[PDB]
Amino acid sequence: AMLSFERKYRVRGGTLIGGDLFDFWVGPFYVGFFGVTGFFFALLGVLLIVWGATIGPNAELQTYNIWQISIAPPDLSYGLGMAPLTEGGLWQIITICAIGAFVSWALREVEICRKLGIGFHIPFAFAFAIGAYLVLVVVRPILMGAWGHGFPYGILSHLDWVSNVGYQFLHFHYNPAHMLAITFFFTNCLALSMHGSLILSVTNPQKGEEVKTSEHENTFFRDIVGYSIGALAIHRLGLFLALSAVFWSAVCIVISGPFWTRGWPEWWNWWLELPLW
């Protein structure tokens, strides 16, 4: 329900669509109009995933093992048209439901932060992950030419899809945007570990000692590496790294196939064929 200091903040208004029709709370959650739409999109998507598991790929390979349940996209011979329900149209319906649910979630966040009077950084950051998913299942299939290029919905089968797509270019480590995205991911993990460690160390000092001040935080990292970035700038940098990783991963996957159809090492030939050497 409510935290002991929450009742001051449950005010009316700030909705995008609906007004007073859906302006209420359900337990701890705020629903609104987009809450209703997103919840029922998610419910239908879940029920269709369960039915697709019930039907199975055949009558012999059907199983309720959670690692082995997979719902697959259509064939490449259907192009961008609509496939029969049992032959890959269920995947398309579930994809539409998932997109609807994600957009509803983002809009509900926008409503919540309008109500609380805070900035809009959080839905803005969520839009990057939504865009990466959309590149995975919408932009790349259209550029390639068929819905069959999307990945299957299964816990272990989409790993098989990733592996085979990676080996279609004979060596995926030599993709340059892939290297940039991996560098950003590793750097983000390092920065998060350091931020957590420093805050906990300052807040929980040695025994029989008082809480440390803001000067200690800067002095520590100036004495380790000779530079300190600050309290606000560490959060700036964390957001920047986490979003750059996703942006460059989307770039790396959208150029594989649509814009390059050979092995990835060969792409570096422009460097090796310069007249300098």
């Binding site: 929450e6 005010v11 009316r12 208004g13 909705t15 709370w25 809480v211």
Partner: protein, 259 residues
């Protein structure tokens, strides 16, 4: 000493089960740490039961943790008791989960986006015991960076682009050199009010400050300081909350909806 314990079990399976047990323990620990602020919850279940059933969920709360503050400022318990308050609003509808209406004049109501708790009434201190946020009239060793506007004498305009005063002084932070506040000399009451940087946009071309939170006529109700050289944690929160309330209560079209 081999890799097969039985006909079906092996080492790499026992290792994953041990990891799952450790992970369950870690999740319980983290959720218990999460519950040091705002619990036990305030719900209908407690008040119907006459203050008998306390809503904490699972897991329950931890034993109190002690923070000791520097310069003999005192001691604070991480899980503590706080006095229940009477809000300045009134429910829109009697069913549970209904919103509240900000009774009175919404800007001067202390409810909704214009709400804040009551923090300690003492100034934040440096490593030597000085006040932390002070105007540049006492932090004389500070200076404005080169090739920068120096926003003294800039006119401040309200939400509707109407001038509401001029900047008189800049409040900076001794421990970390950066600007935390602007001082506006309102030309409607002959008073001076503080303005957080997070609510002001620097138009460096024409030398202006844009305040999109409240209108020009609203600069006459900003909460004031006790002394003209330092600020306390209470007053800073009050000043920020007053401007935050304008993000919803400024105009008739800001309550929504679009359709």
């Amino acid at each position: 000493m081999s890799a097969a314990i039985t006909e079906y079990m092996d080492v790499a399976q026992l290792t994953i089960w041990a990891f799952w047990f450790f992970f369950a323990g870690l999740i319980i620990y983290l959720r218990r740490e999460d519950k040091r602020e705002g619990y036990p919850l305030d719900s209908d279940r407690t008040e119907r039961s006459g203050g008998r059933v306390k809503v904490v969920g699972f897991p329950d709360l931890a034993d109190p943790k002690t923070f000791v503050l520097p310069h003999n400022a005192g001691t604070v318990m991480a899980p503590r008791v706080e006095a229940p308050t009477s809000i300045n609003a009134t429910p829109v509808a009697p069913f549970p989960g209904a919103p509240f209406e900000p009774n009175g004049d919404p800007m001067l109501s202390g409810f909704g986006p214009a709400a804040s708790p009551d923090r300690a009434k003492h100034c934040d201190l440096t490593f030597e015991g000085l006040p932390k946020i002070v105007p540049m009239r006492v932090a004389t060793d500070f200076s404005i960076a080169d090739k920068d506007p120096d926003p003294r004498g800039m006119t401040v305009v309200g939400l509707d682009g109407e001038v509401a005063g001029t900047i008189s002084d800049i409040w900076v932070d001794r421990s970390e050199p950066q600007i935390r506040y602007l001082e506006v000399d309102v030309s409607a009451t002959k008073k001076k009010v503080l303005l957080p940087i997070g609510f002001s946009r620097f138009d460096k071309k024409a030398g202006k400050v844009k305040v999109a939170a409240i209108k020009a006529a609203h600069f006459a109700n900003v909460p004031a300081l006790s002394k003209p050289d330092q600020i306390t944690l209470y007053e800073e929160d009050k000043v920020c909350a007053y401007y935050a309330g304008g993000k919803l209560y400024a105009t008739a079209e800001r309550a929504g909806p679009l359709l």
